[PDB]
Amino acid sequence: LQLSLPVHLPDDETFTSYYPGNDELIGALKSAASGDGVQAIYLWGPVKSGRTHLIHAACARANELERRSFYIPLGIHASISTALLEGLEQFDLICIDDVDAVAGHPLWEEAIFDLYNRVAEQKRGSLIVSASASPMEAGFVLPDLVSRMHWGLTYQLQPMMDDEKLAALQRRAAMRGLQLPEDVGRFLLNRMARDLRTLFDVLDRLDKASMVHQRKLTIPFVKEMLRL
């Protein structure tokens, strides 16, 4: 039987790389990640607003500081057990992405509530969760659970602006010292359905490919590397 799924933490998702109304939020996550923050943080916002990025960045920071993190993408609740939450309070940072994937589920709600209390009781670290709505609007039912969420810090992420994506791309390319012609950036942006996560995955592949082949990112080179 299959016991696990290999996962990885993208190395370009850090607090620095995040495209800059989000300041207090970052400081709270950094503090949590370092052992100096609140016991519970709840981050919410619309799809593609950067919830996963920021969770990844918190885990990255905790790892930097030789602190142990555990990440759960709760969107895949159909293939995992509430038993997974047991003993996680032994970690310095526990992150549950898309915790609202199980909103209204009596068994998951009780298990998560129990985890909140165990993390609090251990006093070593923090639980960070993300959702697409506030605690009182995401559909959580267990009143005690909603209380734990509401009593921690709660941050709303503002939506990413579609017309700011090119600026975000050129910034991320610059931070890599990757030369990206403006028009090639615009091509890539619009060929990737204007999806930043796809774009940034591609940017990483092109950065490596450019080094390997000692070539500039031209249209012919990008088409060849991406099979476009």
Which tokens hold the place of 147?
């209380």
Residue 162 binds what, of Cl ion, a second copy, Na ion, none (CB under 5 to 8 Å, by partner type)?
none
Q: How many CB atoms lie within 10 A of CB 217?
A: 21
Residue 212 binds what, of Na ion, Mg ion, a second copy, none (CB under 5 to 8 Å, by partner type)?
none
For residue 174, the surrounding DSSP H or E stretch is helix 165-175
What's the half-sphere exposure (Cβ side, CA atoms, 13 Å) at 13? 18
96 phi, psi to nearest 5 deg = -120, 105
Q: Which residues contact 119 (CB under 8 A, 6 or more apart)?
A: 39, 40, 88, 89, 94, 125, 126, 127
**Residue 24 or 104: which CB sits closer to a second copy?**
104
15 binds a second copy (CB under 8 A): no
- Contacts (CB under 5 A) with Cl ion, residues 104-123: 111, 114-115
Give the footprint of Mg ion on this chain (CB under 5 A).
51-52
DSSP 161: P
For residue 64, the surrounding DSSP H or E stretch is helix 51-64
- Spell out a b/e string for 167-184, using b for 16 or more CB atoms within 10 Å of the CB, else e: ebbbebbeeeebebeeeb
Q: Is 154 assigned a ligand-binding role in the annotation?
A: no
Q: Which residue is nearest to ligand CDP (CB)?
A: 50
Q: Is 56 assigned a ligand-binding role in the annotation?
A: no
DSSP 3-state of 180: coil
129 binds Cl ion (CB under 5 A): no
Give the footprint of Na ion on this chain (CB under 5 A).
39, 119, 125
- Contacts (CB under 5 A) with Cl ion, residues 171-190: none
49 binds ligand CDP (CB under 6 A): yes
Stretch touching a second copy by CB under 8 A, among 33-41, 98-106, 174-182, 213-221:
98-106
33 binds Cl ion (CB under 5 A): no
Report the interface residues with ligand CDP, using CB under 6 A: 13, 18-19, 47-53, 78, 160, 168, 196-197, 200
Report the interface residues with a second copy, using CB under 8 A: 1-10, 52, 56, 59, 62-63, 66-73, 75-76, 78-81, 83-84, 104-107, 109-110, 139, 141-142, 144, 192-193, 195, 197-198, 201-202, 205, 226-228
